[PDB]
Amino acid sequence: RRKTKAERNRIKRRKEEERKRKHEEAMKRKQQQLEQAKKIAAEVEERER
Amino acid sequence: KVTKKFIINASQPASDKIFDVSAFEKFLNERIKVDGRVGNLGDVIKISQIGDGKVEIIAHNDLSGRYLKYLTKKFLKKMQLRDWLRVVATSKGVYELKFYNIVND
Amino acid sequence: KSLKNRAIIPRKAVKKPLSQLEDHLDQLGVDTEAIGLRARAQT
Amino acid sequence: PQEVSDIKKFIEICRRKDASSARIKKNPKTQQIKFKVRCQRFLYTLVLKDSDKAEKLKQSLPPNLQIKDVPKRNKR
Amino acid sequence: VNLRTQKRLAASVLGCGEGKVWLDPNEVSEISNANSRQSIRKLVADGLIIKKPVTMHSRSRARELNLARRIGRHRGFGKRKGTADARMPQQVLWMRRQRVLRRLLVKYRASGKIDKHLYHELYHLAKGNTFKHKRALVEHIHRAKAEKARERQIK
RNA sequence: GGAGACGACGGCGGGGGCCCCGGGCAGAGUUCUCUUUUCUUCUUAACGGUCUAUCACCCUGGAAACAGUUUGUCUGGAGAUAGGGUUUAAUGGCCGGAAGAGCCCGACACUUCUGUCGGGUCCGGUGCGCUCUCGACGUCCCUUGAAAAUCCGCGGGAGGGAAUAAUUCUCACGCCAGGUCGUACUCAUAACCGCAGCAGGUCCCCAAGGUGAACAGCCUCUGGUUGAUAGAACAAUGUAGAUAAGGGAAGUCGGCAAAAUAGAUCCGUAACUUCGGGAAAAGGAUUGGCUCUAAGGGUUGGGCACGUGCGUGCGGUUAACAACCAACUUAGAACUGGUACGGACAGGGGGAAUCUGACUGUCUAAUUAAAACAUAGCAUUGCG
RNA sequence: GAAGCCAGAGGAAACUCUGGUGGAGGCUCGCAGCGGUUCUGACGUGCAAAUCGAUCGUCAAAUCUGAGCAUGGGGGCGAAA
Numbered sequence: 079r080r081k082t083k084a085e086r087n088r089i090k091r092r093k094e095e096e097r098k099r100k101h102e103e104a105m106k107r108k109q110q111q112l113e114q115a116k117k118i119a120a121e122v123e124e125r126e127r
Numbered sequence: 128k129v130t131k132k133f134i135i136n137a138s139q140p141a142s143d144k145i146f147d148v149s150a151f152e153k154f155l156n157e158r159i160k161v162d163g164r165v166g167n168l169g170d171v172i173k174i175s176q177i178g179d180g181k182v183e184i185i186a187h188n189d190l191s192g193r194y195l196k197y198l199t200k201k202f203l204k205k206m207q208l209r210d211w212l213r214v215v216a217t218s219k220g221v222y223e224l225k226f227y228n229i230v231n232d
Numbered sequence: 233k234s235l236k237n238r239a240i241i242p243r244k245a246v247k248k249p250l251s252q253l254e255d256h257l258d259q260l261g262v263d264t265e266a267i268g269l270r271a272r273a274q275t
Numbered sequence: 276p277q278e279v280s281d282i283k284k285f286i287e288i289c290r291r292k293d294a295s296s297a298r299i300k301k302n303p304k305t306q307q308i309k310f311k312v313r314c315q316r317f318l319y320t321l322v323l324k325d326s327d328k329a330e331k332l333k334q335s336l337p338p339n340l341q342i343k344d345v346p347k348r349n350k351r
Numbered sequence: 352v353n354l355r356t357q358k359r360l361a362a363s364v365l366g367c368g369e370g371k372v373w374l375d376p377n378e379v380s381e382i383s384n385a386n387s388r389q390s391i392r393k394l395v396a397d398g399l400i401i402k403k404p405v406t407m408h409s410r411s412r413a414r415e416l417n418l419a420r421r422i423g424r425h426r427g428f429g430k431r432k433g434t435a436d437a438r439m440p441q442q443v444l445w446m447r448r449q450r451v452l453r454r455l456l457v458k459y460r461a462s463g464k465i466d467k468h469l470y471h472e473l474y475h476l477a478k479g480n481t482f483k484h485k486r487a488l489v490e491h492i493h494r495a496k497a498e499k500a501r502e503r504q505i506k
Numbered sequence: 507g508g509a510g511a512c513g514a515c516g517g518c519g520g521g522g523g524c525c526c527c528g529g530g531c532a533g534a535g536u537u538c539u540c541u542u543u544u545c546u547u548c549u550u551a552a553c554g555g556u557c558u559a560u561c562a563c564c565c566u567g568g569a570a571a572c573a574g575u576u577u578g579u580c581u582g583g584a585g586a587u588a589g590g591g592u593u594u595a596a597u598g599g600c601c602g603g604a605a606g607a608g609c610c611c612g613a614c615a616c617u618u619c620u621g622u623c624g625g626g627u628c629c630g631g632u633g634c635g636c637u638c639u640c641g642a643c644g645u646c647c648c649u650u651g652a653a654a655a656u657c658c659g660c661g662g663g664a665g666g667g668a669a670u671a672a673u674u675c676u677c678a679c680g681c682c683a684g685g686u687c688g689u690a691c692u693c694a695u696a697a698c699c700g701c702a703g704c705a706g707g708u709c710c711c712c713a714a715g716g717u718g719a720a721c722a723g724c725c726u727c728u729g730g731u732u733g734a735u736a737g738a739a740c741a742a743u744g745u746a747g748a749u750a751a752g753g754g755a756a757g758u759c760g761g762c763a764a765a766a767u768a769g770a771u772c773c774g775u776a777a778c779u780u781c782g783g784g785a786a787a788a789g790g791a792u793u794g795g796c797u798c799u800a801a802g803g804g805u806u807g808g809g810c811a812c813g814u815g816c817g818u819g820c821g822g823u824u825a826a827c828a829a830c831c832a833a834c835u836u837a838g839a840a841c842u843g844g845u846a847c848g849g850a851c852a853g854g855g856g857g858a859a860u861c862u863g864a865c866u867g868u869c870u871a872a873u874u875a876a877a878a879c880a881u882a883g884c885a886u887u888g889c890g
Numbered sequence: 891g892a893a894g895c896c897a898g899a900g901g902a903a904a905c906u907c908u909g910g911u912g913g914a915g916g917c918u919c920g921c922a923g924c925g926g927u928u929c930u931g932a933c934g935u936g937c938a939a940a941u942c943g944a945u946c947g948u949c950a951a952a953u954c955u956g957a958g959c960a961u962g963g964g965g966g967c968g969a970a971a
Binding site for chain 3: 144210
């Protein structure tokens with residue numbers, strides 16, 4: 079059936095909501111990597127060796 | 128409810144007995160307008176003296192320090208001190224009165 | 233005032249004479265010797 | 276200029292041979308910190324929240340890489 | 352003592368016109384001793400050279416006239432100088448009216464107040480200049496609904 | 507095979523910049539009185555990442571009770587509407603660049619050398635506005651509106667290719683190199699030409715505010731000037747600008763010149779005509795200020811039963827209702843000043859006819875702009 | 891305010907009328923530009939070996955204009971003076 083402007087606005091709002099959730103989850107994984115940065119440095123050292 | 132704090136420092140001209148803090152308080156009480164009308168202070172804006180030639184303004188509305196500086200300059204023009212006294216923002220919400228730069232001739 | 237053709241120079245950009253300041257304060261009724269404007273005046 | 280979103284990739288970039296220098300920029304109004312490394316082609320910027328672990332990332336950064344803090348005024 | 356070079360240098364340093372440059376008339380020799388942009392900057396910092404502010408061009412009367420024209424003044428037959436089409440185009444009025452009517456018809460069809468056949472008929476009536484405005488279109492839609500309900504009750 | 511690579515004009519939509527409106531911090535001005543006032547700074551490049559942007563294309567499905575749809579009537583069984591996607595296109599949002607810059611304000615230091623340290627640089631709105639650019643349409647042609655260098659894609663399958671590992675990978679990072687000139691300044695009432703620092707001539711961009719239909723006229727902001735022999739007096743005759751009682755062309759070869767008309771809204775408009783015009787024909791009524799009224803818009807938002815912020819199965823078209831936001835026109839009424847009301851500026855005198863050339867257009871630079879020339883149409887001649 | 895289009899009212903239909911839409915024309919008022927009609931105009935050893943003022947024609951095109959290039963005196967070019 080042909081959709082309504084309210085339904086289109088709801089679809090749009092879900093689109094920016096999922097974009098914001100992706101951005102927040104990327105910030106969380108960056109923070110986790112910053113927390114475990116020393117092990118990452120050791121692994122980079124091991125790979126270069 | 129938000130509360131805004133404003134200091135009008137006039138300690139140096141008050142100690143030099145050039146600026147009258149009580150007269151300035153009366154001028155502020157008669158000229159500060161709320162909702163476009165003077166004499167509409169009530170409990171919204173309170174003007175007092177905290178000593179040492181300093182004026183306290185407590186405002187629960189969106190009163191502006193720019194408006195307070197405008198009224199201070201109006202009072203200085205009425206007292207013929209506009210050409211010799213300057214109102215300078217020193218801190219956030221604090222306006223201090225001081226002399227202009229003077230040369231010795 | 234000549235505001236039709238040019239703007240008035242700001243008061244902070246012009247340094248005031250001590251003699252003029254003492255004369256104006258004396259006319260207003262302030263004892264200049266009791267406050268010491270000579271020390272406040274620069275050179 | 277390029278922005279790095281991975282701590283591992285930034286560590287490898289700082290261990291690249293062409294990484295001549297590095298600097299740390301602090302933005303306290305935004306409460307963020309930036310690690311900028313100067314390579315041959317690109318300046319790589321890592322953006323982090325201002326935190327103690329962000330400060331301790333200096334220890335994981337290589338020692339021979341000359342790292343400096345950005346002053347408040349860029350004096351010519 | 353000539354100060355043309357100093358005035359030009361002060362204008363270039365201060366980033367203004369040469370008419371906005373003020374040189375101190377009591378420090379003419381010290382200003383004339385300045386031949387470099389560095390010395391001009393030093394004199395600007397010392398205050399012997401300042402940039403004069405701009406000449407006043409206020410907009411208060413224009414804003415007052417805009418308020419008066421918004422509340423309805425100064426639009427009489429002795430104030431109009433262009434033709435009616437020149438002041439307000441009939442083509443722009445028609446475009447606005449057609450866009451309002453088509454937007455309302457699209458909204459009604461989407462919300463299900465009117466069906467698709469009635470939408471087509473009202474679209475072609477709107478193109479054929481039946482309705483002066485949205486209110487007239489709404490009354491026509493209400494009358495059509497009332498006639499349809501009366502026909503359904505009769506049948 | 508594509509790109510390079512292409513006309514003119516018309517309206518419509520998107521984006522940047524400019525203009526305009528409101529709030530805030532800081533500074534400046536005004537202040538007899540009024541003005542929470544007026545003005546000023548409040549900015550973000552190339553180059554990249556990422557998320558999106560009309561056309562178009564694809565999948566499902568099969569439409570008359572025809573439907574979708576633009577300001578503009580085009581599209582559809584050669585597959586529309588609807589639903590879901592894919593992509594050309596950024597001068598759009600955010601991020602890196604990049605605040606460390608630029609800008610504004612303040613406080614110290616300062617023979618100079620020289621500066622030093624703080625606080626900010628924020629949030630919105632509007633549009634028949636101006637300018638540039640992009641996109642989709644449309645109109646016109648007996649007019650159909652460059653070429654090449656250069657770059658890319660495809661068809662084809664020659665060669666070259668691996669487990670001693672190979673790689674002839676348009677991916678990422680890294681290494682090296684980039685020669686010659688020209689670059690000042692003017693571009694014009696003084697830098698060019700006219701014998702000259704000559705009121706002449708000489709090709710382009712960028713283009714603020716008010717009035718107003720308007721890059722009309724007039725005033726103003728930025729930026730520029732204040733440069734063109736001076737001083738005194740106010741005779742005749744001049745050049746330029748004006749007014750004049752009464753009469754109103756009696757003037758003069760001749761209404762030459764001047765005056766009168768003029769914008770906008772409404773009423774109304776003849777003969778003739780190639781039916782397109784004439785026509786703004788003619789002739790009339792009105793226009794200031796103030797206080798109101800009315801009309802013309804945009805955005806968002808519907809109840810159950812389950813699974814669990816979405817998926818179905820239903821149920822209803824009084825949302826014909828609420829909340830928020832918004833700008834310019836049009837019409838009507840009262841009151842009020844008047845010698846004036848398009849109060850300056852700006853801006854058709856009109857009509858009855860005759861001759862004449864069809865019209866638009868062109869020429870005698872430096873005495874003639876026209877019934878001259880050209881033009882479309884028509885007619886004739888020559889050529890296979 | 892030309893084709894084209896929409897709606898309403900008639901007509902058996904072709905068409906007729908009414909109200910809109912649309913934006914055509916070597917159309918029209920008019921700014922700049924281009925040109926050069928008139929004035930007992932200014933100027934007349936001039937600002938000028940053709941200039942100045944007002945007024946005027948034209949203003950979406952047979953419009954205006956730069957650079958490069960071509961045509962050279964028994965010639966060229968010429969909407970023909």
